[PDB]
Scaffold this active site. Sequence first.
Site, PDB file in Angstrom:
ATOM      1  N   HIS A  97       0.233  -1.297   0.119  1.00 29.98           N
ATOM      2  CA  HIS A  97       0.240  -0.029   0.096  1.00 29.98           C
ATOM      3  C   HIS A  97       0.916   1.394  -0.217  1.00 29.98           C
ATOM      4  CE1 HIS A  97      -3.268   2.326   1.704  1.00 29.98           C
ATOM      5  NE2 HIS A  97      -4.296   2.003   0.605  1.00 29.98           N
ATOM      6  N   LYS A  99       2.653   4.782  -0.875  1.00 29.34           N
ATOM      7  CA  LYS A  99       2.918   5.574  -2.280  1.00 29.34           C
ATOM      8  C   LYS A  99       4.027   6.256  -1.683  1.00 29.34           C
ATOM      9  CE  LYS A  99      -1.937   4.797  -1.245  1.00 29.34           C
ATOM     10  NZ  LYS A  99      -1.306   3.277  -1.793  1.00 29.34           N
ATOM     11  N   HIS A 330      -9.171  11.663   0.070  1.00 27.29           N
ATOM     12  CA  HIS A 330      -8.159  10.177   0.432  1.00 27.29           C
ATOM     13  C   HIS A 330      -6.395   9.415   1.275  1.00 27.29           C
ATOM     14  CE1 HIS A 330      -5.957   6.104  -1.744  1.00 27.29           C
ATOM     15  NE2 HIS A 330      -7.045   5.665  -1.040  1.00 27.29           N
ATOM     16  N   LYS A 332      -4.544  10.511   4.693  1.00 30.25           N
ATOM     17  CA  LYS A 332      -4.711   8.869   6.144  1.00 30.25           C
ATOM     18  C   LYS A 332      -3.428  10.536   7.001  1.00 30.25           C
ATOM     19  CE  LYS A 332      -5.629   6.288   2.903  1.00 30.25           C
ATOM     20  NZ  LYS A 332      -5.104   6.407   1.652  1.00 30.25           N
TER      21      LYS A 332
END
EC number: 3.1.4.-
Length: 419
Positions: A97, A99, A330, A332
């Site tokens: 996950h 990025k 989107h 976090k």
Amino acid sequence: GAVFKLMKSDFYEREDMITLKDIFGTETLKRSILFSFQYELDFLLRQFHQNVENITIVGQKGTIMPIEARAMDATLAVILKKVKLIEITMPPFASHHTKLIINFYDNGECKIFLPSNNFTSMETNLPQQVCWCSPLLKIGKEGLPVPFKRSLIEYLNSYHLKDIDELITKSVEEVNFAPLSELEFVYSTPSKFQSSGLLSFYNKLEKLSDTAKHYLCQTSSIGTSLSRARDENLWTHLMIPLFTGIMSPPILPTNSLINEYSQRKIKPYIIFPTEQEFVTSPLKWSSSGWFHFQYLQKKSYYEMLRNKFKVFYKQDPAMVTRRRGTTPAHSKFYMHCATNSQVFKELEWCLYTSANLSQTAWGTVSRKPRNYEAGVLYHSRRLRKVTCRTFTRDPTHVAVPFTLPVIPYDLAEDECFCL
């Protein structure tokens, strides 16, 4: 210095901010090392300049979309030949996950970025996205390695891949991270040899070190209960209790926790889109596909968070821009504020990361994470308060896509969006 920027969108900014072209389109860019959960190759490669010499892509087997011949051309063909792929195989329902972008430019310049969007056109333009940009770094001998650098290397080493060790880590080692001496690199890895996730994050907050305790979380996905027998949420039943001291590693009953919260003046927040907020979004439900909270099969879990802990918060309708409306983000964020409208302008600490509020991303006290995740932590005792502002009003340490303040869910009608 490091700065947070809001990702520009082809829809919202049709007629400060940043674009992937700003990041990869520079003629001075020499090499890009990429990490992501999904890659739309023709979309991504179109962002680069012909001058690029190498593009190293780290991704999960099956998440890299090839470019069809019918969509190719002369320009793209050149870029494509410079791409090197490092595929990672992972157990079903586990995700790479993370990025992350590590750029190397003309002269000995290097820059690091943490975008919240994966590299696809849809993700880049529909939900709101942000991008953390590191300060300019330079190649050159290093004295004592900055914590950020030390942590990044542990993360890379935790992949246990020769290709990573030689093609990526060796290059990172040559860079001097002095400009990042104040920040921390927080991550998750499924490696059994490297501690990470919640356990590691908890220890770090402890080492780094009358008042209301605000603990807010902004996430695009909300995991289910930590147990099959009882209703236990990662934020309310494990993370917050650990951070506050209510519990310590070697889960309390809901009611016991609720009393603890009252007595300690602990206030939990979880920012997640309501069903109605999509009605007031420019692209309506277009961005809804990336927000997951499946609570229909266990309604009690949801009611507990919504009514007992009153944990849900939404956007302030009066503060959002017209061009973006109440479109969810989107990104976090995990942050803590201590007081004694203005809440969150000054923070004790703030973590921006790819990690959603789930056990698979963070693991628990006993279980390790199943995903690869990465983020950056700002801590007051490492900078004496972390300053934060909302992009909805556009110099602070942190900038967030959600409004400040956020508004509590109206218990009479508000409901979390359930895809």
